[PDB]
Amino acid sequence: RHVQWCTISHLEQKKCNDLVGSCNVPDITLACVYRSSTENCMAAIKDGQADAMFLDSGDVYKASLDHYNLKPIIAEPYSLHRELTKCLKHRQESLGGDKMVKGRYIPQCDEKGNYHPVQCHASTGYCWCVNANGEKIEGTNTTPVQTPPTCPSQVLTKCLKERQEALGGIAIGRYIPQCDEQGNYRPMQCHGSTGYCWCVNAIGEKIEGTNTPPGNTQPTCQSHDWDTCHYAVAVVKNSSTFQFGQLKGKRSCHSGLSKTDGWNAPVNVFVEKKLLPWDGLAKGSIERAVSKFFSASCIPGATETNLCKQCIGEEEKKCKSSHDEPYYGDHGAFRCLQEDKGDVAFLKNTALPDEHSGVYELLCPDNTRKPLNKYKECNLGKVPADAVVTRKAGDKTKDINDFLLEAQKKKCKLFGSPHGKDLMFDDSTTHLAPLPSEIDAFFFLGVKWYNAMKALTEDVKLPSKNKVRWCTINKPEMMKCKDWAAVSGGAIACTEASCPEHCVKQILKGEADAVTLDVQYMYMALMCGLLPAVEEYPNKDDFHPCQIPGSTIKDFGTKRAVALVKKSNKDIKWNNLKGKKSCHTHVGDIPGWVIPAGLISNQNDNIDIESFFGESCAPGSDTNSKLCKLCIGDPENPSTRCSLSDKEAYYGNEGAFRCLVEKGDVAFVPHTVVFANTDGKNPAEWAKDLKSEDFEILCLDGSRAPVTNYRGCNLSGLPPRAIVTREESVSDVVRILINQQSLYGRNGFEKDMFQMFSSAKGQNLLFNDETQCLIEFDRQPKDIMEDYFGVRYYTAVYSASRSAVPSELIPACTFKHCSNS
């Protein structure tokens, strides 16, 4: 196994070559491939000449476009503010679940708010070991008949870990970090031998401008600093006296044309302050307008002559996006100011001097100047993290992650070098961790910074707030949507994707505006930040909420999952279904499987619904399991048993009701199946005048109820299907869809020209054909999960937690960003 690292300079290739010698990662060999600039390396990676490089967030965006097709895979974790610990968050969630779902696991936290390494489930007496995230170490479960397991201690905090490491087995003459009672870093740190002191934030990163030799006054250190985003700054010497608003005509040093801190951040502010006569691409290129602003500059990678005049690279190296240009990058631009080739340098806080005292200070955009350690209040914006990138195909992602994880374990010299600063990686880097597997540049940079860097390259025509771009998941849907657009007078347009999750992505990225989602995609949509705009109202018995919008809705008409038993079976209650014989409509059904499997899992320590029951029928399971024993294949015997077809006599709503009456004690079905198959409503012989007053439903409190009281004695009601959009577009989509409904709904004034809720092109296109109308979602002041799902369903299926991961998109779309206001 090989990893080929692309380097951009002779200096960086030197450091990479040293790593090949010094860093011994078994199973994976590093090699180094030289190219002359950042862009030549991007192309080398695209072409397979190399596998990975580290990119500034501005280059991350550039590499993500079709020219190069690279994606970020590894970056340093950062933090925006202090958060609740995980254990305390989990406690709060589960205590907010549905109290009628009895016997749920409530985590046990310790005096620092972490998980006790032994976790227990009160109602079952089972204990197990957990990791720091509170996730069960599988195979450590012990039963109440046994003593609690012996679980290893939790991993130490960063500060306590690095303290114990530094001590080895007192470490004389070396820094030993000082930790607070919570095990985080004390704000002030001192070197126990040199006498120097400085400030750190809560995770131990140094605050620049605070390093203090002994005998001097130290700057005040802020406590509880969890904002570890990097900030773009403008740095100047204290011997000059201009302010930010007087930058016109000065000499400037920039980290580089493609860097977010050297280009995007300052240009963004130059434009917001109208220091720059530029606003759109009709006014020329931004680089040209900047060329008219400064007199001479060093901006590596530029083409305008004055914007390279101040660089000092020899011959073809001059003004190259490469360390062979001595003024390239953050520490290059600072050097350019130091040697007085510029009056101001544009870089980021992590490249500022460590020492408090000296000739440098910060130029604030509000036309004041402030000390180096005040960058959080004197900056040109937070900027995104930087990242290691590879091909979008990801053929080398695992080898790159393995190598860097193991090199970091062995403490290889990744993050400094005698040959120079910021070679291969930023010298300020401390750890590189893998990014979510579905991350791309949009989700890594965040919509705000992504749009901001797009905005400097093209005129981004924002689509109209009076048009809803509907996202379709198959060709018949697209055709029905084009017919809607033709009568809509421009209010409706169409986009095409392959599945609902890709529609969610398009809505997030501003390529579409709305889509109808089945219940099973809503957790993912709500977790990514979309909101229900309107919902499908399916109650055929009441059209009043559809006639007069805004009206009160007595019953929304959604199905309610119930547990169905015969009145003859007086001994069975909810609390004793273990080992009984159960009938499921099929594996994957929500009212007959997901809702029951969720409740069994929450009350029995995730013990399989397979093992929970005795002999059952659940079409879709493997034919050899105890979930197919009750399954009667086909009356016309063929290889049709436990099958996902009407071949299986026990498949579906009515089929599970068969399995109950024939050979079973309980069936999980919607509340409608019994009424559709009793009172002689089904002609078949087995339901021969079978009486609705011959069955009951099981309540979760151990009681029972006649099947007519499904409203207050159900496993869980389902939520309606929902039309979701971005938070800011809810009001638009509601207004447009309600107007369309008055024209083309079931009582539409123009229903002869188009019908929203049916079609000849197929079934349930865009909306479900049984929809009565779309009802605006009345947002309540509670968690959106509880608001949309209802507490019962949220608890039953997701444990009332925001931490389930039904889709691998969720970790990408919830990734946190470094954006401004």
Interface residues with ligand YH9 (CB under 6 A) are: 535, 553-556, 717, 719-720, 777-778, 780, 787-788, 790, 792
Give the tokens for residue 405: 């994880």
> Whole-number minimum distance, CB 790 to ligand YH9, in Å?
2
Using the minimum distance from each CB to ligand YH9, give the nearer residue, 533 or 628. 533
Minimal distance in Å, beta carbon 792 to ligand YH9? 5
- Rounded to a whole number of angstroms, the minimum distance from the CB of residue 675 to ligand YH9 is 18
CB 714 within 8 A of CB 515: no
Task: Report d(CA 707, CA 362) in Å as an integer.
Answer: 73
Element (H, E) at 476: helix 475-488
Closest CB to ligand YH9 among residues 551, 576: 551
**Measured from the CB atom, is 422 or 535 closer to ligand YH9?**
535
Beta strands in 222-289 (DSSP E): 230-237, 252-254
Q: Supply φ then ψ for residue 96, to 5 degrees.
A: -85, 0
**Smaller CB separation from ligand YH9, 426 or 536:** 536
SS3 string of 42-57? HHHHHCCCCCEEEECH
Task: Identify which of residues 178 and 801 has a Cβ nearer to ligand YH9 in the complex.
Answer: 801
Residue closer to ligand YH9 (CB basis): 165 or 778: 778
Q: Which two tokens stand for residue 586?
A: 């099929």
Contacts of 711 (CB under 8 A, 6+ apart): 555, 560
Closest separation between CB of residue 378 and ligand YH9, Å?
Answer: 44
Residue with Cβ nearer ligand YH9 (381 or 720): 720
Report the nearest approach of ligand YH9 to the CB of residue 814 (Å): 22
- Residue 344: how many CA atoms within 13 Å on its side-chain side? 25
Which residue matches tokens 């006014």?
283
Minimal distance, residue 517 CB to ligand YH9, in Å: 12
Decide whether 555 or 636 has the Cβ nearer to ligand YH9.
555
CB of 97 to ligand YH9, least distance (A): 13
- How many of the other CB atoms lie within 10 Å of CB of 557? 17
Integer CA distances (angstroms), 617 to 52, 222, 592, 649, 721, in order:
52, 63, 11, 10, 28
Specify the residue, 266 or 717, whose C-beta has the smaller distance to ligand YH9: 717
Diameter of the chain measured on Cα atoms = 99
Q: At what angle are helices 500-508 and 519-528 packed, to 10 degrees?
A: 20
What CA–CA distances, in Å, run from 136 to 119, 132, 183? 8, 10, 24
Half-sphere exposure of 374 (CA within 13 A, CB side): 12
- Residue 595: partners with Cβ closer than 8 Å, 6 or more residues away: 561, 668, 715, 716, 718, 793, 796, 797
Q: Which is nearer to ligand YH9, 299 or 737 (CB)?
A: 737
Residue type, 294: F
Q: What is the DSSP string of 314-366?
A: -GGGTT-SSTTSTT-SHHHHHHHHHTTS-SEEEEEGGGS-SBSSSSEEEE-TT
DSSP secondary structure string, 401-444? HHHHHHHHHTT-S-S--TT-SSSSS-TT----EEPPTT--HHHH
In this complex, which beta carbon is closest to ligand YH9, that of residue 61 or of residue 794? 794
Q: Which positions ≥6 away from 516 have C-beta within 8 Å?
A: 536, 721, 722, 723, 766, 767, 768
Nearer to ligand YH9, 726 or 792 (CB): 792
Please state the closest distance from residue 778 (CB atom) to ligand YH9, in A: 5
CA pair distance 745, 762, nearest whole angstrom: 18
Q: Return the percent helix, strand and coil in the chain, to nearest 5.
A: 30, 15, 55
Q: Which is nearer to ligand YH9, 555 or 685 (CB)?
A: 555
How is 177-190 classified by DSSP, letter by letter?
--B-TTSSBPSEEE
In 642-712, the DSSP E strands lie at: 666-670, 695-698, 704-706
In the complex, least distance from residue 556 CB atom to ligand YH9, rounded to whole angstroms = 4
Closer CB to ligand YH9, 8 or 800, in the complex: 800
Q: Whole-number minimum distance, CB 538 to ligand YH9, in Å?
A: 11
Nearer to ligand YH9, 97 or 719 (CB): 719
Helix (H, G, I), strand (E, B) or coil at 136: strand
The residue number whose beta carbon is nearest to ligand YH9 equals 790
Location of structure tokens 């084009």 = 482
Neighbours of 304 (CB within 10 A): 17
Q: How far apart are CA 625 and CA 813, in angstroms?
A: 38
- Give the C-alpha separation, 591 to 658, whole Å: 16
Which residue lies nearer to ligand YH9 by CB, 59 or 787?
787
Please tell me whether residue 692 adopts helix, strand or coil conformation. Answer: helix
Q: CA 494 → CA 479, 486, 720, 774, distances in Å?
A: 9, 11, 23, 19
- Per the structure block, which two tokens stand in for 20? 């090949």
Q: How far is the CB of 584 from ligand YH9 (least distance, A)?
A: 23
CA–CA separation, 240 vs 125, rounded Å? 72
C-beta of 492 vs 738, nearer to ligand YH9? 738
Looking at beta carbons only, is 196 or 710 nearer to ligand YH9? 710
Question: From the CB of 775, what's the least distance to ligand YH9, in Å?
Answer: 7
How near is the Cβ of 293 to ligand YH9 at its closest, in Å? 52
